[PDB]
Subunit: 246 residues, 2 copies
């Protein structure tokens, strides 16, 4: 599979910090046909970022609407994203499920709208600490994946992201071995629900804590095909995380 490394800048950035960061990113020489590198800036920063980043870099937005064009103040439709040639969208990030009541139904409808408008989707999911200590990690993940997996028609255009909530921002850390076990189970879900070819084709990214010191140990795992990097993607050192996948 083609590795995929993404920068989720979340809600961070200034016109000037973006100029400096994008310049640093542009200095990295990589072949976009061998590895996908996607930058996800804040909506109002998209134009600025797309222009500053060299073409080898792909771009996208951090959220998209399940409603199409219409009376939906504050939303960005997949139709609008398509008209702007925004290539990727992130769906179901745990922060939107946590702070903005995003549900599995929302995730499903957002993925459908995205695919219908030729957008590629980075779909996130993951179990909570309570669910993990209750031994329902796979039960939870299966339900979350099955809420939308049947919508995937082209397995190069949808990228899955496992987010180990118990090890994100908690000080706790998930081992590469623990990550791998979950990633292998996720691929099996795709295999049983969709097919073996489809399962072996789809990219499953690790969306937990990723930095320059652990990226190599993670990307090395058989079922981890890249990362959805958070705050670490706001540092120039993000280029070293990208290099671990080259």
């Amino acid at each position: 599979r083609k590795y995929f490394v993404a920068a989720n800048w979340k809600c961070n950035g200034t016109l000037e910090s973006i100029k400096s960061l994008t310049n640093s990113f542009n200095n990295l020489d990589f072949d976009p046909s061998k590895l996908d590198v996607v930058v996800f800036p804040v909506s109002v920063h998209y134009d600025h970022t797309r222009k500053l980043l060299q073409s080898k870099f792909s771009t996208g937005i951090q959220n998209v609407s399940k409603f199409g064009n219409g009376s939906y103040t504050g939303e960005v439709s997949a139709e609008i994203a398509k008209d702007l040639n925004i290539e990727y969208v992130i769906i179901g990030h745990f922060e939107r499920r946590k702070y903005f009541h995003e549900t599995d139904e929302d995730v499903r409808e957002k993925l459908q709208a995205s695919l219908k408008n030729n957008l590629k989707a980075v779909v996130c999911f993951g179990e909570s600490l309570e669910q993990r200590e209750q031994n329902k990690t796979i039960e939870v993940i299966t339900k979350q994946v099955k809420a939308f997996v049947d919508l995937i028609d082209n397995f190069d255009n949808v990228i899955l992201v496992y987010e180990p909530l118990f090890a994100i921002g908690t000080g706790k850390t998930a081992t590469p071995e623990q990550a791998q076990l979950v990633h292998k189970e996720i691929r099996k879900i795709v295999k049983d629900t969709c097919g073996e070819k489809q399962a072996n084709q789809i990219r499953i990214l690790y969306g937990g804590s990723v930095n320059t010191e652990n990226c190599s140990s993670l990307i090395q795992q058989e079922d981890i095909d890249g990362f959805l990097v958070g705050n670490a993607s706001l540092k120039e050192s993000f280029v070293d995380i990208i290099k671990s996948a080259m």
Copy 2:
């Protein structure tokens, strides 16, 4: 009071449609020092819209985060808006309260964040059809306004918007008289919770259904200082709605 006519494009527009519409708007000759005219495009359309619209037109975004910069995927903070020199933000539009569980406390926190970052805010509120039938219009409005009114420091920087949900997509219609009665009460609420001088200077816009056919009858009301226009702001004739306030 300086009249205020705002265009809420909601989730509509393509690069080309915006080009055509903005050209039409730029044809209108008005004095920005005598009248405020603000256009609120979709977040990803902001750069395009701002460059196309002549300086006489003010611009803003349809929503802002209740959080500051940080790990809030998909949100646009007040700080980011300030850095981009975005002048206005709409807060509490009924569509966000309807579809995205936005609460009075969310509106409060968003107003506080906006004001802290020198942004001007267009804050919406209004009662539902059931509440009006229960004769609780003023009760509801009073609670919604008191949820954030104490945060207002400069009364030229916060603009209120009354949205009669009972007359929005319900077949029913809100009359200028009914609107004037509510606006007068809203201003009284600001007078009795803040001060008389503050109440006399704050703009209170009508956010119900506004078109070329009823805009004059609305702006004529003594306590109606402009409007937040929806679908009618997507047509060239929006210029005639602006003219009604000139």
